[PDB]
């Protein structure tokens, strides 16, 4: 059984995030999938992969990831923005508008 140290978790997270900025969505998802296989509750990794899923064109996967994050913290506005974006990519526009309204109800309007 494999267990990742904090440095090893960080290594996968930051390499995945930086590769995602480099347009290497494939490299990002492979690295972040590995992290989240061994550390399923790594929240920052989940967020990074969700946006990467929205960029590797995996909207149905992205919707389930957003629903996963919402159930962990229903008050975090960014989770609902992620749900709205995945749903409009999946063609469910009316549901994407309800999710976006939840994002507006929870977001910090000072940012």
């Amino acid at each position: 059984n494999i267990t990742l140290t904090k440095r090893q978790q960080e290594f996968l997270l930051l390499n995945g995030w930086l590769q995602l900025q480099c347009g290497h969505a494939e490299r990002a998802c492979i690295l972040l999938d590995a992290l989240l296989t061994l550390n399923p509750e790594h929240l920052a990794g989940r967020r990074c992969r969700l946006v990467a899923l929205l960029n590797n064109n995996q909207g149905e996967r992205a919707e389930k990831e957003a629903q996963w994050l919402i159930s962990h913290d229903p008050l975090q506005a960014g989770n609902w923005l992620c749900l709205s974006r995945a749903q409009q990519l999946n063609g469910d526009l009316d549901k994407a508008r309800h999710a976006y309204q939840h994002y507006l109800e929870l977001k910090d309007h000072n940012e």
């Binding site: 090893q8 997270l13 930051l14 690295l31 590995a34 061994l38 920052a44 969700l50 929205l54 960014g78």
Partner: protein, 71 residues
């Protein structure tokens, strides 16, 4: 909306990057340790990650030879 996309990227951002007094040595150390660790796994996804890490670890060694030839 471009603003929503920027808000998405801000949400995806972990908000920090590699740190410490020897992040150059620490990166190659964690990279080499992690690729050998994930190689022992039976999951194809972990094997793919280990193989990806091995590729860049050795593709860079090839590029270092080119840089030396190009000075």
């Amino acid at each position: 909306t471009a603003q929503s996309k920027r808000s998405l990227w801000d949400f995806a951002s972990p908000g920090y990057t590699f740190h410490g007094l020897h992040r150059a040595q620490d990166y190659r150390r964690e990279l080499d340790t992690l690729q050998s660790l994930l190689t022992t796994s039976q999951s194809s996804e972990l094997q793919a990650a280990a193989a990806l890490l091995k590729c860049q670890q050795d593709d860079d060694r090839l590029l270092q030879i080119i840089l030396n030839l190009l000075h």
